[PDB]
Amino acid sequence: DEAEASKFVEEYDRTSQVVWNEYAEANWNYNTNITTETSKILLQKNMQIANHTLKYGTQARKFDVNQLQNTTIKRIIKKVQDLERAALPAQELEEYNKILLDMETTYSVATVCHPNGSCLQLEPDLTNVMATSRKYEDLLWAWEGWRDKAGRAILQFYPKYVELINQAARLNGYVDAGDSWRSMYETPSLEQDLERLFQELQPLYLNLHAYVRRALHRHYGAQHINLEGPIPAHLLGNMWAQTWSNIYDLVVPFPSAPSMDTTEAMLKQGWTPRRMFKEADDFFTSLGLLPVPPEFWNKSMLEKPTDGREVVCHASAWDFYNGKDFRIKQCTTVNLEDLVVAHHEMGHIQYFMQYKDLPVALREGANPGFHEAIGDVLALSVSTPKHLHSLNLLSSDEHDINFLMKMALDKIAFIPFSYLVDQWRWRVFDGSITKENYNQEWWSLRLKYQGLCPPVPRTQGDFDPGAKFHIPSSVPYIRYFVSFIIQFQFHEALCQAAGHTGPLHKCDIYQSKEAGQRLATAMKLGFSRPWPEAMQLITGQPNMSASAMLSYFKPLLDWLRTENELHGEKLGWPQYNWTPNS
């Protein structure tokens, strides 16, 4: 009956709270200090948490979820029926846990070295090279080097990882791991929805792509850029060419409308990692939202350690399942990019604090895309020239188009990349792409979606997906695609909630209590209701929609079409088989 159901849920929540808190401590200890000792402890704590998952998960499966009255209790028990990795037999589980840790450690300690010289780490060294160098061969060195050292080293683990994660998925009632991952959205038409959203943003991407390709042609020379072909993947200012904002100087629509160098400003004016997170905190509280607790500042790792110890540098936010302990771990560099990243991570923390009073089983975003979007929404307002000037980091129509271009280089360029990652992965999980086709199929999608080509031919042993954090880390990626669509939807709604009129891209929601209240009511729901409810509460409607993003960039689309047509650009890459002759 209903009495036995709510009793079970209560017991589950009490015990999960304690054991997940213990696991988090062990996880944090490894992530902020990679050693044999901390690795061993984490693997042991994995086994502990799995015994808890198996125990309650087995009990959960005795309940007929669809015979239960209460929909909150229904959602919890259904979720507990999914054991995840704990469904695996003991020895397979320990193998799986070891594989995950080996992949993570391998990625986190990988270096690219000059012969008899310095060894560069991904953050900050190779990131800086990719962002600042305008020398074809130096960029190639970093790009190829990272894939030679990180990508190739991951390959030996990946097939077995795939086999084990699929096995876990099947034992939990899914057909493969991709099926399992997509189900987090509880949206049967997810694939169709995502495809249509991608389609709607093609005109804008193809126009941005063609404009950038022309600018690259001017800088790197006619012998190295085919104006009707894909762009070499090492030229976009980012290791994965996932965001292109670092090549702004090469593409600026109006050089006669120059903007302040934001990095120098931050460095000259004495910005620090701590002050960067404080400014994000200040934006959140200005909306009437919650401040981070005192403990956050005591326990967080907001910069790379100097005692030579190995860490997982990739920015992350941590819920210790206590309602009190929340942390950010980020190897922060003093620049505008990482200020944006800081807001993103603080969005996660805000979400943690908003739903901390829910049962632990419901302490998640409405869907994974929602969790990613929160910080980005506020960052959109932070990014406005108006607001950046108020922070003394920047000093009309030309500047407007300049700004839109700058925003498109991050936001628009990321749409096809964030779509591609899990398109590749779902097909690996479903067996459509085998281990013999891993890399070739990755570059087929890189071409199809992004219009990029590798600068150098790929060889046997290459596993370029391995060189992207989320692949060895086993973190789903489609959430970021969803995030980039919906954050503009959130922006549009919060802007009219704040009374702002005029072009969407000029909106700054700073200090708006009405905008804060709308985000708050949705965030408080956690995972307790289907996501269209949270979507409805923020936006006044229940769908994912590209309309807001299109509206934001409307003036840029018009300007790009004009510019591309007058320069005679072919939109797309008709000569799709072109690769560098170099």
């Binding site: 997940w20 996880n27 992530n31 920015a315 936010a317 819920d319 969790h371 990613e372």
Partner: peptide, 7 residues
């Protein structure tokens, strides 16, 4: 648990 970035 732990939530990242593009990311």
């Amino acid at each position: 648990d732990r939530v990242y970035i593009h990311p």
